[PDB]
Amino acid sequence: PPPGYAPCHEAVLPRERLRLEPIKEYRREGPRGPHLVGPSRCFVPCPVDTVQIVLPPHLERIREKLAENIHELWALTRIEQGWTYGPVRDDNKRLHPCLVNFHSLPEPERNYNLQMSGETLKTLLALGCHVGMADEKAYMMSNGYKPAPLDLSHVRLTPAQTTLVDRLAENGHNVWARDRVAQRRNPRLVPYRLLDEATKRSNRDSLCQAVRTLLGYGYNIEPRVRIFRAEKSYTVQSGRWYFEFEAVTTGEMRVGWARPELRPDVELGADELAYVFNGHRGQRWHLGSEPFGRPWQSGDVVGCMIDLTENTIIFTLNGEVLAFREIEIGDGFLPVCSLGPGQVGHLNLGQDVSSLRFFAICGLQEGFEPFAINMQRPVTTWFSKS
Amino acid sequence: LAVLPLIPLFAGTEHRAIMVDSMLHTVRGRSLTKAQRDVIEDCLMARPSMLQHLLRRLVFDVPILNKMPLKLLTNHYERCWKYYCLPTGTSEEELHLTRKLFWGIFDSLYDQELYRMAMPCLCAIAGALPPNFDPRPVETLNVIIPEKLDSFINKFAEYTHEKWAFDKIQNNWSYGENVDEELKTHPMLRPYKTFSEKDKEIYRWPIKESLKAMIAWEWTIEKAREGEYDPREGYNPQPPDLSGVTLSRELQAMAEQLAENYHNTWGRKKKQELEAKGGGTHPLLVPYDTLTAKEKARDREKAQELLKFLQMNGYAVTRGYFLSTPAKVLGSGGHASNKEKEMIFCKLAALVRHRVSLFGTDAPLHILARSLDARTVMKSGPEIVKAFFESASEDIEKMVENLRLGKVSTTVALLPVLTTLFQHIAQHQFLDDVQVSCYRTLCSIYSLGTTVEKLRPALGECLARLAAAAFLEPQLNEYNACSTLPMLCSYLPRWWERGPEPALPAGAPPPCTAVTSDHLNGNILRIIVNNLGIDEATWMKRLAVSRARPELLHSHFIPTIGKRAGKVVAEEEQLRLEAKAEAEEGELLVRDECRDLYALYPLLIRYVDNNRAHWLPNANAEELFVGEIFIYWSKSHNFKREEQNFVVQNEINNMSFLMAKAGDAQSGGSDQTKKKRRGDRYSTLKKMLPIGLNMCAPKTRYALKDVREFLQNNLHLQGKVEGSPSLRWQ
């Protein structure tokens, strides 16, 4: 069509590949059976000061030095490929005047480095991050020009420096995003937070080369939830019982037994009406958290349990006994699952062949019954609706 | 009659204010202590925040405490601070300031020790946060404001008229001859320019007294930043939005403090006025911190109006959690002063502060690590005493607390270990307290296990002192220090020593074996099997002590290292323990017509049962669907030894001086691979086993009451059932 548009094939610009999904979805159809899933996740990048703030000229000159050494690092980045000193304003020619010391460089093209480096320090004034003078300011046979920097490989960078610097590269990538707003898609319209890591390698190598050049300058810088209730018909309240929670993604599960009476509005276990534990932290969770056990690593199946007569609720991790002991029976009880926005459960109920590893090792020994021993039909389930 | 209460909410909080007033009367006498019980239990019953305002009055009362009855009020406020800390895990930070005021009470100085205990509790509440009125208004009229500020006072006074007029306009007041409230008119509602300067002074005087109060406190007030409903009858001011101005916490403290000035000034004038009348009192005639924040607000709105008017004019205006951990660093400076005392009654306060310090350590950011270094410094000042003394023991528990501070996550402190190592050479010559410092260094080394090398080589020299010849505790401390291929070949020599069974030298090498357990972080697993052979040697020692218990801890390190083939010989060893327990129970049968001496053998056998706990491999039993079931029969026989009589109680006596359930899993195997799942579908032998449990009530003949071996498995299940009947008591 003649119409102004861009093809959706170009919508693959950020990083995600073009597949297809059934929207939201409480239940992906996995190989061992129906994983419970969700509840799903999802904006425009913007330039930000930084620029309103301004570094003192005394520091910005040392930034011009750091920019000179970084430009020499760019000379390391280029000249080994095939480049030489002397004028020629084109990348294809494999020659460029600015492959050298800052005084030798044109004093507009050098600003593409130096002044921009200043922005980094301007950004250091923007975050409010500490950035004092921690220390007093201070070989390959390259073809053509041969710059000779003091080694940047001194003190290893603090992780906070790398993180704040990745924020800086993201910020400059955002100002560049405004720069391409003046240019229906472009190669890097997307914010640095959401694009392929191989593309991230450039901005991170730049921010880290800059942080290392600062390290040679002595500078340093430091700074809803888906439920899965069982059907109320299935509310066991008579003798021992058990169920296997196979688990995929590590995450905010709140797997465990809970009463049919429970209100969905509450996230699980804050109310008296639920007895569950988190899928990470490993803390058991009723009327607020208590410590209990190790978080399971991804793929580490849960094994929930309820004693009755001598009423109790027991948890396991692949047969590793780890809970809510001495509970009163009320109505009850039903298996219940929980999912934070990305997570994926897989709460199998009965069918002993479907159970493996985590079942026979403990539950069968204790006389516990999987649900489907009573049930020809698949058990029904109830996710909360948003 | 106030004891009877001990048996919406805001009115009850007012009643709390009243009981607190009776406590102020207490601040008859024993009866007043009963009233203290009334306020205390009332505090125990319990909203809580109004009680924390009353505890703000009790906080200023705590400042008054360092009179003793007010310290008792601080004690009830302390137990309440603990219950509230339980509620905690606003004005709470001010309560932490009350805790720093309690530290000032420590600065003021028997009963002081218990007061230091209640202060330890309030300080613990502050740590939960960190996770006769005597007014003293400052002299002001003697103070001289610079004249350039006075023209600004003309402006703030003009604003005061703008607000005083605009607020009357909010109720539709207008200019009139007289103060007729019903007429909705007032005489003064006229433009500020119309005022004679003395008429302006009626607004100015409190304001000038405020600025003079600021200069008397030497607060800076200086030029900086540039300055910045139908209409009614009469003058119509449109005052600037001072309310939207936001004071910094410095300036917010300045507003709280000028409000404290209006409080002490108006309060002092109120007191001199009541002394003039011979009169009683006013509700506000209480110290400014005692006030509910809403009571503070009545002048706080004014002082904030002033400082915000200043910030709107842009003038610089100045007085001239982790921060509590920095106050702990100041406490480390006071600890340096205590070291100056160490170079030689405040020292008893240093001891109470040491207890408060260990308690602060129990409560749990580079500054905290600096405090860990200061803890290393005070540990060095204690190290000078190493080579009251009970207070030094408190400093030792504080040293293990310093190890806990090392567990929370300069290098010079390590050099103090290097001096400590040389002292160990003196142990080769033969100061037990220096060995205790080595023990706290060992637990601190475990804190390193939670996450300068030359000093560790000096520790290797201390290992050479361990090889140079009580000492077993030093060996365990060395094993804790362990958290090196020649040491591995030496471990092979320790395996040769395990073949040898002299035993005390094996205790000396046991620390090296635990170091080998540290080496687990490959070949090290098979070496751990050789260490299981070392466990077979320790069991050879167990055939007929505490060093074998530290070696049992090393067996737990083998549990970290936990292969089945060693567990078969281990099954033979547990069977030796079973035949031994049966021979000993037969000795008890001889006693019927002895075992207490063998009870220690039952204790070492219990350590072997802990070694069986190290074997806990139930998944291997799932794979079996094997000899492990016979081991279950052995452990069941041990349960039958528990079922005998007093001998198990003698093992409890062995516990005072210092299992079978997993075997029940094996009993499931008696029911049966997939056949067991077929039994799940059945909803096999287990019912017959229950019949055997019915037979157990009255024992191989009960198995004969019934494939006879399956009946024997039913009999082990029957004895396991009777053991469960023993479990019914628990």
Swiss-Prot record, chain A:
Residue ranges of every copy of the B30.2/SPRY domain listed in the record: 184-354
Repeat (Sequence) residue spans along the chain: 39-138, 139-223
Reported effect, residue 229 to W: Decreases protein stability
Domain of life: Eukaryota
Subcellular location: Sarcoplasmic reticulum membrane
Tissue-specificity statement: Detected in skeletal muscle (at protein level). Fast- or slow-twitch skeletal muscle.
Modification after translation, per record: The N-terminus is blocked. Channel activity is modulated by phosphorylation.
Outcome, altering residue 212 to C: Decreases protein stability
Protein function: Cytosolic calcium-activated calcium channel that mediates the release of Ca(2+) from the sarcoplasmic reticulum into the cytosol and thereby plays a key role in triggering muscle contraction following depolarization of T-tubules. Repeated very high-level exercise increases the open probability of the channel and leads to Ca(2+) leaking into the cytoplasm. Can also mediate the release of Ca(2+) from intracellular stores in neurons, and may thereby promote prolonged Ca(2+) signaling in the brain. Required for normal embryonic development of muscle fibers and skeletal muscle.
Similarity remark: Belongs to the ryanodine receptor (TC 1.A.3.1) family. RYR1 subfamily.
Subunit relationships: Homotetramer. Can also form heterotetramers with RYR2. Identified in a complex composed of RYR1, PDE4D, PKA, FKBP1A and protein phosphatase 1 (PP1). Repeated very high-level exercise decreases interaction with PDE4D and protein phosphatase 1 (PP1). Interacts with CALM; CALM with bound calcium inhibits the RYR1 channel activity. Interacts with S100A1. Interacts with FKBP1A; this stabilizes the closed conformation of the channel. Interacts with CACNA1S; interaction with CACNA1S is important for activation of the RYR1 channel. Interacts with CACNB1.
Domain notes: The calcium release channel activity resides in the C-terminal region while the remaining part of the protein constitutes the 'foot' structure spanning the junctional gap between the sarcoplasmic reticulum (SR) and the T-tubule. Pore opening is mediated via the cytoplasmic calcium-binding domains that mediate a small rotation of the channel-forming transmembrane regions that then leads to channel opening.
Name of the protein this chain belongs to: Ryanodine receptor 1
Species the sequence originates in: Oryctolagus cuniculus
Gene name linked to the record: RYR1
Residues of the full protein shown: 804 to 1241 of 5037
Curated annotation (Swiss-Prot), chain B:
Localization terms from the record: Sarcoplasmic reticulum membrane
Disulfide bridge map: none
Post-translational modification note: The N-terminus is blocked. Channel activity is modulated by phosphorylation.
Tissue: Detected in skeletal muscle (at protein level). Fast- or slow-twitch skeletal muscle.
Sequence repeat start-end pairs: 132-228, 229-320
Region span, Disordered: 659-680
Assembly behavior: Homotetramer. Can also form heterotetramers with RYR2. Identified in a complex composed of RYR1, PDE4D, PKA, FKBP1A and protein phosphatase 1 (PP1). Repeated very high-level exercise decreases interaction with PDE4D and protein phosphatase 1 (PP1). Interacts with CALM; CALM with bound calcium inhibits the RYR1 channel activity. Interacts with S100A1. Interacts with FKBP1A; this stabilizes the closed conformation of the channel. Interacts with CACNA1S; interaction with CACNA1S is important for activation of the RYR1 channel. Interacts with CACNB1.
Family of the protein in this entry: Belongs to the ryanodine receptor (TC 1.A.3.1) family. RYR1 subfamily.
Domain notes: The calcium release channel activity resides in the C-terminal region while the remaining part of the protein constitutes the 'foot' structure spanning the junctional gap between the sarcoplasmic reticulum (SR) and the T-tubule. Pore opening is mediated via the cytoplasmic calcium-binding domains that mediate a small rotation of the channel-forming transmembrane regions that then leads to channel opening.
Something else known: Binding of [3H]ryanodine indicates that the heterozygous channel is activated by Ca(2+) concentrations 4-fold lower than normal. Single-cell analysis of cotransfected cells shows a significantly increased resting cytoplasmic Ca(2+) level and a significantly reduced luminal Ca(2+) level.
Functional summary from the UniProt entry: Cytosolic calcium-activated calcium channel that mediates the release of Ca(2+) from the sarcoplasmic reticulum into the cytosol and thereby plays a key role in triggering muscle contraction following depolarization of T-tubules. Repeated very high-level exercise increases the open probability of the channel and leads to Ca(2+) leaking into the cytoplasm. Can also mediate the release of Ca(2+) from intracellular stores in neurons, and may thereby promote prolonged Ca(2+) signaling in the brain. Required for normal embryonic development of muscle fibers and skeletal muscle.
Protein name in UniProt: Ryanodine receptor 1
